[PDB]
Structure 1
Amino acid sequence: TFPIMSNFERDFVIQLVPVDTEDTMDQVAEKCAYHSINRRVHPQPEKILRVRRHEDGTLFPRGMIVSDAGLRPTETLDIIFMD
């Protein structure tokens, strides 16, 4: 378990999102999406959801665990659309 702060791309708002220490960038992204896609953001399934650290713009790879990301509790994450 772990708290993070989702900066979902093209949402208006940073939001509080619980994730698990055992997730993947991919499953993090998905947990964030629950709170932003089809609430205030339109699906882009042309597109891939990437997870990057808000503070220094570092992109984490789709496969990586939360638990090796070295995040601070509550750390702010960019949740992006590329491939």
Structure 2
Amino acid sequence: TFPIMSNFERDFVIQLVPVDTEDTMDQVAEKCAYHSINRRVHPQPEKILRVRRHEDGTLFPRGMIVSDAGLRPTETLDIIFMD
């Protein structure tokens, strides 16, 4: 278990979202979407959710796992729509 701050695209607030060190970025995005999609943001079925480090804008590959991302606990991440 590892805490991160989700800054979901088109949402208005950053939120606390607990992910797992073994989660892939895709699974991180899914856990983050749970707190924004269909609550405050409309789904975009034709897009793919990507994870980007908020501070410098580093884009993490879909398959990279938290364990290898070099994140600081509670690190803020942008969850953006792409393709």
Whether the TM-score (by the shorter chain) exceeds 0.5 is yes
% identical equivalent positions: 100
Q: Deviations over 1:16-64 (max 9, x none)?
A: 0000000000000000000000000000011000000000001000000
Root-mean-square deviation over aligned CA pairs: 0.4
Q: Deviations over 1:57-77 (max 9, x none)?
A: 010000001000010000000
Question: TM-score normalized by structure 1?
Answer: 0.99
Structure 1 unaligned runs (5+)?
none
Q: How many pairs were matched up?
A: 83
Equivalent-residue separation in structure 2 for 1:81 and 1:56 (angstroms): 18
Question: TM-score normalized by structure 2?
Answer: 0.99
